[PDB]
Amino acid sequence: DVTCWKYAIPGEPGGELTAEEVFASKDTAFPEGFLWGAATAAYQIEGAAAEDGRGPSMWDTFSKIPGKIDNGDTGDVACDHYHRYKEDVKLMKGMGLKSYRFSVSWSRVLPEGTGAINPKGMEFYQNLTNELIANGIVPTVTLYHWDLPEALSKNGGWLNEDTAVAFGQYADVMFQALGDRVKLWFTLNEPWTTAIAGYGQGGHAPGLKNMAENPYMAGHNQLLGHAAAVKVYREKYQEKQGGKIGAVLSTEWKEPLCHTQEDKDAAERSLIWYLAWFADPIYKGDYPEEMKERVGDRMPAFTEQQKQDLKGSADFFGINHYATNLLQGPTEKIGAENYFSDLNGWIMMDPRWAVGDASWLSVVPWGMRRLLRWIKHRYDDPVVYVTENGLSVPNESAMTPEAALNDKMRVDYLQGYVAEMWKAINYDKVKVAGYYHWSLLDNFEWSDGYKVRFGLVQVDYKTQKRTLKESAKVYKDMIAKYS
């Protein structure tokens, strides 16, 4: 008499409403001033990797090593956005985007990660910022989106607290240069992924392998980096510039496989290990107690000063979200030994769910609603920005370019997840203030290379031609309708 594979919540307001029904309703509206946007990251789109003074990032180093990137791809050229940024901004104007989320290449501004500003690098981000504002688009900026300067990577990267210090000094430089115009700052993008993929599994730069200790240490120093950047911002810039700052965290929604307390506990535990790992420090001042107790001497301890620096170090909750996982309570005692054994949960997908162009991307729109609601509950009703959400259409690169433009699945993903976001705003009272679709452009999808396509806008990498897909046009109409 144990119910499994049944995710509907009895009595949930709006639970049964389809995306079509949500958008057909005359009463469906979004908050005033809602920031409809799209997101990118510097290494994924800019190119010009070794021109105009840019120093190498650890992803330049990583991508040059045979076997690290699928199909031998690199970010050397990417979408050539460094040269073509004016055209890309005009595309965004045409779509009526309210806002754009981009990242700054740390090593384009500070080639060694510290020291002298590279004038042409700084000038690019000033020019990009001005171009956005001149075209009515609100610029929002990610300071760290994985392109750690190689010089810092060589000195231990996020396993070295020196990197956190350097990050704070870099944030300082960017606030001073752009903060008169940029009023929404994201410190780090997906510290989970940097820690696990970059330092734990080695699938991402810098390619290190240790799941017992490295993820927790890399997470630790990223958090210290966040605290340092926010401290600078609050003390030196915030009163004067009147902007806001926060982190961009990430997780799948974690849904219990069965209606048992064991599976409910396992699902909650995965949310803690993925998201609260970073958010409890930022909102409450320390790691979750259950993580400290489970992980023991493999979890670094914050000093008293660090806890003070971390508590309350966000003005909003940035969240990247794509997918949902089912969680099961293990039936045999799991030993705490490494990140995935520590969280004591068995992870799976419902085979009935559609998937994107990688196995991690399950298409489960209601996960968006449930995660947003979870965030509201745990972190005392913060301002929330959905800072990434999007779809890689399976085998899109093997389609004719013409067929790829008719991206019905991406249309359905956009509509579905936005409708469930709306439910969170309307029924669950989550204070969502913006939504940034991943991505404006097809781009360098890290270790998957260019084969995996997330764009609203198709890029022909041979000619660099941009072409709007169906989803871009649907998104344009959505934004105009709900201003």
Applying CB under 5 A, the residues found at the interface with Ca ion are: 127
Helices (H), 243-365: 261-271, 277-284, 289-295, 304-310, 339-342
- Between 53 and 394, whose beta carbon lies closer to Ca ion? 53
Angle at CA 190, nearest 5°, toward 55 and 108?
A: 15
CB of 158 to Ca ion, least distance (A): 33
CB of 137 to Ca ion, least distance (A): 16
How are beta strands 431-438 and 35-39 bridged, if at all?
A: parallel
- Between 18 and 127, whose beta carbon lies closer to Ca ion? 127
Nearest to 286 by CA among 310, 263, 305, 268: 310
- Between 28 and 130, whose beta carbon lies closer to Ca ion? 130
Say which residue the tokens 């969680």 belong to. 327
Minimal CB distance residue for Ca ion:
127
CA distance 137 to 460: 25
CB of 199 to Ca ion, least distance (A): 37
CA distance 363 to 347: 16
CB of 134 to Ca ion, least distance (A): 11
Is 190 a known active-site residue?
yes
- Between 127 and 261, whose beta carbon lies closer to Ca ion? 127
The amino acid present at 331, given as its one-letter code, is T
219 contacts 157 by C-beta, under 8 angstroms? no
CB of 130 to Ca ion, least distance (A): 6
**Which of 46, 388, 420, 445 is an active site residue?**
388
Is 388 a known active-site residue?
yes
**Which of 46, 150, 190, 420 is an active site residue?**
190
Q: Is the dihedral of CA 242, 481, 389, 16 positive or negative?
A: positive
- Between 86 and 259, whose beta carbon lies closer to Ca ion? 86
Contacts of 477 (CB under 8 A, 6+ apart): none
CA distance 302 to 311: 12
Which are the catalytic amino acids? 190, 388
